[PDB]
Amino acid sequence: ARVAVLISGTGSNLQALIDSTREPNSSAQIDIVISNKAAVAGLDKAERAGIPTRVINHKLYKNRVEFDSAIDLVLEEFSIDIVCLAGFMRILSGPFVQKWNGKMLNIHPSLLPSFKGSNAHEQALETGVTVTGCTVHFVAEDVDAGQIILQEAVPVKRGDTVATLSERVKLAEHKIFPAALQLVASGTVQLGENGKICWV
């Protein structure tokens, strides 16, 4: 299966996906990395790995639909089967999500359905949980509400900050996102006709 990874930043999840998809038994290959932001470290990681990159600046487009159309054009150019959102921080439009339904994965640094949104660690710390984690899910129109594929719990330690908690949770992210991608790319897991997750 042919994979696009979309990013907005550092790209540690991208790097874990690059490493995993290059193992001999990988059912996924990463054929393009798309960033909505120029000059981010994730683009360096892609170039270093010999993977093509494109920057599609959302601030140059009139609305969300035009931006998504620009993304979609590149996805078609590279005959992409699966899209991974790996620190990509834009909400995708309904029609784009529907087109890629069952074919687009997102990583989120909480145990969904807790702490939906952009600042999950801040929320976790404010709430005072002692267990948080991360989630890979299929992308649905409703943000952070799509079908869950894998999750991993991560403890919150006394005195944690966003810096230390996000660091600990990223260790888990780098495990479950490659695992989830392999499950979907191998056809082991799919979004069922009833919309629920199906293990074949």
Report, in Å, the least distance between residue 25 CB and ligand 3YE. 28
Tell me whether residue 90 is annotated as binding.
yes
Contacts with 77 (C-beta within 8 Å, 6 or more apart), sequence order = 32
Q: Is 92 near ligand 3YE (CB under 6 A)?
A: yes
Q: Tokens standing for 147?
A: 């079908």
**Which residue has tokens 């035009």?**
66
> Is residue 26 annotated as involved in ligand binding?
no
Q: Specify the length of the chain in residues.
A: 200
Q: Which of 20, 35, 173, 183 binds ligand GAR (CB under 6 A)?
A: 173
Which residue among 57, 63, 98, 118 contacts ligand 3YE (CB under 6 A)? 118
77 DSSP assignment = H
User: Rounded distance, CA 99 to CA 193, Å?
Assistant: 15
Distance CA 113, CA 140 (A): 14
Residues 51-110 that bind ligand GAR (CB under 6 A): 86-87, 107-109
- Work out the number of other CB atoms within 10 angstroms of the CB of residue 99: 14
Q: What is the largest CA-CA distance in the chain?
A: 48
Q: Is 108 a catalytic residue?
A: yes
Is residue 137 near ligand GAR by the rule CB under 6 A?
no
* Binding-site ranges for ligand 3YE (CB under 6 A): 85, 88-92, 97, 106, 118, 139-141, 143-144, 146
Binding residues for (6R)-10-formyltetrahydrofolate: 64, 89-92, 106, 140-144
* Binding-site ranges for ligand GAR (CB under 6 A): 9-13, 42, 86-87, 107-109, 118, 120, 166, 170, 173
So which residues are the catalytic ones?
108
